[model samples]
Target chain A: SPILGYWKIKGLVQPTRLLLEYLEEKYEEHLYERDEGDKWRNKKFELGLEFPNLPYYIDGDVKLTQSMAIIRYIADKHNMLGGCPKERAEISMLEGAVLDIRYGVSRIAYSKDFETLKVDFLSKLPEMLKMFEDRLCHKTYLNGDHVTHPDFMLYDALDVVLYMDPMCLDAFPKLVCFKKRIEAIPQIDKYLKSSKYIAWPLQGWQATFGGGDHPP
Target chain B: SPILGYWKIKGLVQPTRLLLEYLEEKYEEHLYERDEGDKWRNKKFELGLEFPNLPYYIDGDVKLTQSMAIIRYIADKHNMLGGCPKERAEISMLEGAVLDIRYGVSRIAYSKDFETLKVDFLSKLPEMLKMFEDRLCHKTYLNGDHVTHPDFMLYDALDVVLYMDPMCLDAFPKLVCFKKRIEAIPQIDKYLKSSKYIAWPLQGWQATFGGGDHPP
Candidate 1:
């Protein structure tokens, strides 16, 4: 009777999945494939909202959409949001930055003209990675010492970037180290090494961004 | 002394300003201009973070950026976030949607090919508006009965949309009414009518989006 998360096989739910794994939360993922289009759309309206979208979370009467909101809900429940108000604000700021980066990546991911965006994406990736690297220079995580919600969010984002170009993080030692640290977490390591974790070369339009065959 | 909000004369701070007005929170807004380029850049690193950006909030030793993060911090302090966990999650979801809309608009707003993007922007605007309209159809506010942080965020976003084309909200009565309700919130009304409120025709790159000379 764990909460149910519904989304397509390849979507923003990865971070939520990662966070749930890290927290040892019991949740059921109801994943849809592209061919299951009618199945998703038919059930979409019955999710009990006037405006519905994919990647929704339902815990009995408490239903939620918006990936970050669902992620934060679970995080808040486990006190993983932050240690205090100021820290929470900082964590939120980091999450905002992560979302901004993801938005930029999504633009490229969903674009029909991947070649057209490739140049812009490549040029800007370094600056974006540098921003995070500068942030992680002296700290273990984005918010320092402790791993907060933004860490999972950032890890997922960086994972996508790494999948795009494995060498992308070579210039940013801190981010590389941070990614390694998150991957080394017991639960995260187990989940990542297990077949339950979905690899890149995402199913649909996202595959256009050169995720290649799969992660090695 | 209140929290110090530093940003250019116009950008993402409008929602934060509106929130402060709605809450009657007196904060010092240190407005900069593009002409003061070096001054702003020089002071940016000194603001306490390496990866600094505009619309940053400084509250004594605690400084934060990312407009939504700052807005949420202030909202949380004033109990304007939401009443409960579920409500807060809903509010966050709404805010995420609002941010997604702004990101979509930003893509077009910052694009070199405005003529090419204009068509896409026009066609998608209604669908986006309809999503919110559907949500607001029966509820007085987004979260119902009470205005939360996302209300201000959505109001500012739709304000820009309407400013771009006044006829934009004609199809969505709930949104039109919601806009009016938020506009008439006494203090918000005063701020809306005041010169201190920076009328859009956003300074810098964002002015490219037809905010025109000023809001009517």
Candidate 2:
């Protein structure tokens, strides 16, 4: 059995849970706590792990760290990424674009100079969304008329954004429609509404857009 | 006509250029001044219409951005990545591992504060390098022996580290051996000797490692 270990209160582990649910895979989700610090310390020694970071996956003695690496690894194994080379390439491209949208180009956009709120960043985003809209409008998914990793990524990204900052998203109608369509996916829809699926909206609308309980 | 734009140095663009050279693909290499505010600002508007960044690929009317994305796209098209799905996946994993090594794990290892660098971060690296050493010892190339993106990524990453701190790689004998192997790649050997591929290091590295054309 695959062991998914993470700290509590949703966070980066939420997406892994979401993906596991989407795939209908049976796995154990172990949430850690401050009180269990001793257990974590012992386990860290036993596992021969280096980082004290949460959201690690242990599979039959083999452990993997890093959320994006884990996500891509699972996606590749499950055949959920894309159908063809072109589709895979496109999905990979979409992932890059999504990363930029969330993290910014320099990785300093969020932490530094956020006081200005950077119109240039906001202006560039709509063009990317328009590209997504052009690709996703007539199709049921990002690549084609089927569920995919890109599709899940789209839903998860949009859901976090809306849950964190619903007002800013109003500027992109196509994206709003796209979000609704993604939410309507049965597996994603079920997970979104489920009690076990964590939601922490404390960051407010714009401030916590990407800071929600999900993998970055 | 295929238009290729990359950073003017052997930093990030080196591997892509190596791949291009290995395939004998006819393309252009565009270089620019890193700290030139006026030039970058003026020229960026024109380039932004294509893909909004450096290391872009313009094939006729279609343009692509992101260095890794451009590499995968070209590699897949020209059969430079790998021959089969398993091989391709292996290559992807290797590249991903290299990414983790370069940005994720390696950065912390080189952090200014030795005490601030978590024990977990320091301990995990040797094991990670050991795994890579084992993998590289068995296979001549990262994908096979024929040379792939991962090989160059490893080379460039190590190059950056060694350039920054001459003694930084003292612990990993296997990594040193691996770097030598990558350097032995005939085209890279030629490129290494060429003035075009040799340039000043990043300013940050200069401040950290002292003034030099290379690391030491």
Candidate 3:
């Protein structure tokens, strides 16, 4: 039996799902949609999940939570973590950076004051984009020539950003190209075109970033 | 030559330092004092660190940042991550949880509304502590039987919390025992007794928790 992954239908698990689809991994997704009656709360109590949080992954006897933890676990299993110890360290660093960006963006994305948040996000985004652009200038991927898990993380995060502001990557040509390259991958391309993919608007309360059905 | 780790005189690097000390690893500290100019900002530009942040670790050709990333890299090198794949995933999950807790505490630690933040922090802390307490009830460590990187994280993070409120762990017996058990490790015990250890005043602006010179 494939590993069972539990998460809300639309949330942080999108990147993990993208990776699974790209790798053609067979896993069962136990999605909890918003309309469903507090399944997550009940599951939390029933399973006695130790740090009860969504995006939990269970493989046979091993159960894991935290999106990055689950992502790294699956990546390590598929040899997508990195090629060597140094590469793995570098990948981890890049992954951390990607997460840092996600946290910053999510703070603004989920804020009660959208107009103010948008202004703040826009003001700070260039510096963040420049960092990625500089890193991508010489390498095909964040860790170097080969695509690793951080690449998926960076791409997915940027997708959300670009969806919010279509021209956000205008100044970062390398990141733009990087996004294009990842999107062009056969499996990723198919997934993007398929109906199974959950496009932005993430949750009901959140503002919808445009281009819901296509890759940025 | 020892690995060269750089950071301000104190901050996020404590757990990393504790891990190195506990493992008896040879590492050189490149400590920067706040009075000596904004050394971190200068060094960040000078080195052009891609994902520029503090708690940077340099070992020959490898230079890594983000405290958890650096911690994991060092942990992996010394077999402190975990013994098996499943164990490793659990360790990673636990480590993420530790980071999440740190982030929550930090927002309050650095916030301008200290009184308000303190109330929020205190209110949410029990549920958080309960999770760890429950986990430690059955297993000696977060990853069962063995001490992994997450243990150092949990220990150091809780150290800060306990510093804030001495009676914080009073309700969690297992966590109290777990804390004592990790500190009882010979090297850790020596380090705790030594003058080199820096107790939590977290940031320079924050009030020094009691027993400022000694480990909690």
Steric overlap count per candidate? 0, 4, 0
* Model 3: per-residue Cα lDDT over A11-109, one tens digit each: 567778888887888887787654554777777756545787777887677678898889888887877765556667788888888877766666665
- Candidate 3, residue B89: how far the Cα is off, in Å: 0.6
> Could you tell me the lDDT of residue A126 within candidate 2?
64
**Candidate 3: docking tier:** medium
lDDT of 2 by residue, A38-128 (tens): 7766676466433333556667544555555566666766776656545556667666666555444223333445535545655566665
Q: Score the docking of each candidate (DockQ).
A: 0.66, 0.25, 0.64
Model 1 C-alpha lDDT per residue in residues A1-216, reported as the tens digit of each score: 445455444457777888889888888778776567789788888888544677788877787878888888888877776656687788888888887776667777766787788677877878777878878888888877877778888888887777667788888878888999999999999998888787754434335673445444
- Cα lDDT tens digits, model 3, B61-172, are 6777788778888887876665556767778888888877766776556556665767778888888888888788778888778777788888887877776678888988
- Tens-place lDDT digits, model 1, residues B165-194: 779888887888898999888999998788
Kindly give the stretch of ten consecutive residues in candidate 2 chain B with the minimal lDDT sum: B203-212
- List the candidate 1 regions with Cα displacement exceeding 4 Å: A2-10, A202-207, A210-216, B3-10, B202-207, B211-216
Q: Residue A184 lDDT in model 1?
A: 90
Q: Which candidate is the best by lDDT?
A: 1
**Model-by-model lDDT, in order?**
0.75, 0.60, 0.73
Better of 1 and 2 by lDDT: 1
TM-score attained by model 3: 0.89
Q: Give the per-residue lDDT digits (tens) of candidate 2, residues B1-216.
A: 667775444545666776766666777666665455466567665763323666677765446666677777767776665554344555665676676656643344334553455456545656556657667676776656577777777776677555444565677777788888877877767777876564455332323332334644
